[PDB]
Amino acid sequence: AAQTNAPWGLARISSTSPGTSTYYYDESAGQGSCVYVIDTGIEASHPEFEGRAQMVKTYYYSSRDGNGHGTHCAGTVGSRTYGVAKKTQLFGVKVLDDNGSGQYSTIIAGMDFVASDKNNRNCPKGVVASLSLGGGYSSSVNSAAARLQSSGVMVAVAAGNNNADARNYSPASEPSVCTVGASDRYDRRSSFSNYGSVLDIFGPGTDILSTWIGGSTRSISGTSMATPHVAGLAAYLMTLGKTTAASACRYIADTANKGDLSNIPFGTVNLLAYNNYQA
Ligand SMILES: [Ca+2]
Numbered sequence: 700a701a702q703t704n705a706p707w708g709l710a711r712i713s714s715t716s717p718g719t720s721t722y723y724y725d726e727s728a729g730q731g732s733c734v735y736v737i738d739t740g741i742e743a744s745h746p747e748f749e750g751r752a753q754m755v756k757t758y759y760y761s762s763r764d765g766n767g768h769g770t771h772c773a774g775t776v777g778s779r780t781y782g783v784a785k786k787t788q789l790f791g792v793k794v795l796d797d798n799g800s801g802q803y804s805t806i807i808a809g810m811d812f813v814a815s816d817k818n819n820r821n822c823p824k825g826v827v828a829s830l831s832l833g834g835g836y837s838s839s840v841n842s843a844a845a846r847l848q849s850s851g852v853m854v855a856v857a858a859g860n861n862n863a864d865a866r867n868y869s870p871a872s873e874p875s876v877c878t879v880g881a882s883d884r885y886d887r888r889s890s891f892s893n894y895g896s897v898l899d900i901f902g903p904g905t906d907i908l909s910t911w912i913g914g915s916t917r918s919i920s921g922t923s924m925a926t927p928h929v930a931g932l933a934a935y936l937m938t939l940g941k942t943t944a945a946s947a948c949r950y951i952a953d954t955a956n957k958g959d960l961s962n963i964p965f966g967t968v969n970l971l972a973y974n975n976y977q978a
Contacts, residue, residue: 784931
């Protein structure tokens with residue numbers, strides 16, 4: 700399948716070179732996989748989700764996304780126009796308030812919830828969790844992310860936007876999950892992207908067009924935007940049977956475009972997510 704005039708990030712993950720505008724992908728498109736988006740919520744009624752999104756848990760008064768961030772991330776995972784895995788099932792877990800903030804105890808609870816809730820869902824091709832959030836180092840937050848991964852969920856987390864070593868942020872610094880940095884359309888490390896030896900992979904994160912609340916769209920930047928590209932790619936590859944939740948991060952790194960990025964500091968991987976599609 701091919702999506703013409705796609706957002707640059709989708710085109711980038713199906714090409715060996717920058718500057719293309721077509722997203723090439725297998726028509727299976729993540730069908731039978733499930734992605735939990737642990738964030739500010741999802742506007743499930745947005746037409747771009749085609750009924751494939753639902754809120755399953757909130758830690759606040761409402762389950763609605765009053766911010767936009769979670770809806771944007773969910774759109775990059777699996778919306779029709781802006782998503783990597785256009786047929787995956789999306790589940791929203793609202794651990795962040797509508798200002799985008801949240802206590803670590805609530806974020807931990809949300810991760811433990813996903814590890815249990817997945818046993819109630821029909822996700823024959825596997826389960827992914829996308830965490831476009833983070834703060835200062837916390838061993839308890841890292842442990843919660845490691846638990847979620849150990850339970851059989853592919854966990855993808857944002858490296859952070861401090862132009863610093865991600866070893867000082869959580870859950871970015873947990874080695875057993877998939878820690879995602881950001882690049883821009885010219886194959887530079889995004890100027891805000893954290894770096895360091897704990898990064899596993901880069902994905903598109905500057906000027907990413909996706910869904911927004913009120914049935915709208917908008918373009919924003921962040922490692923929060925790169926993470927759902929990798930989460931969606933994992934769901935896509937699990938549906939194709941190429942990998943499992945336990946090894947998807949390693950498989951993505953092994954099959955990545957290598958050496959293409961600039962402004963990568965010594966000691967950080969130079970690996971860009973790639974779907975290796977061949978018509
Ligand atoms: Ca890792």
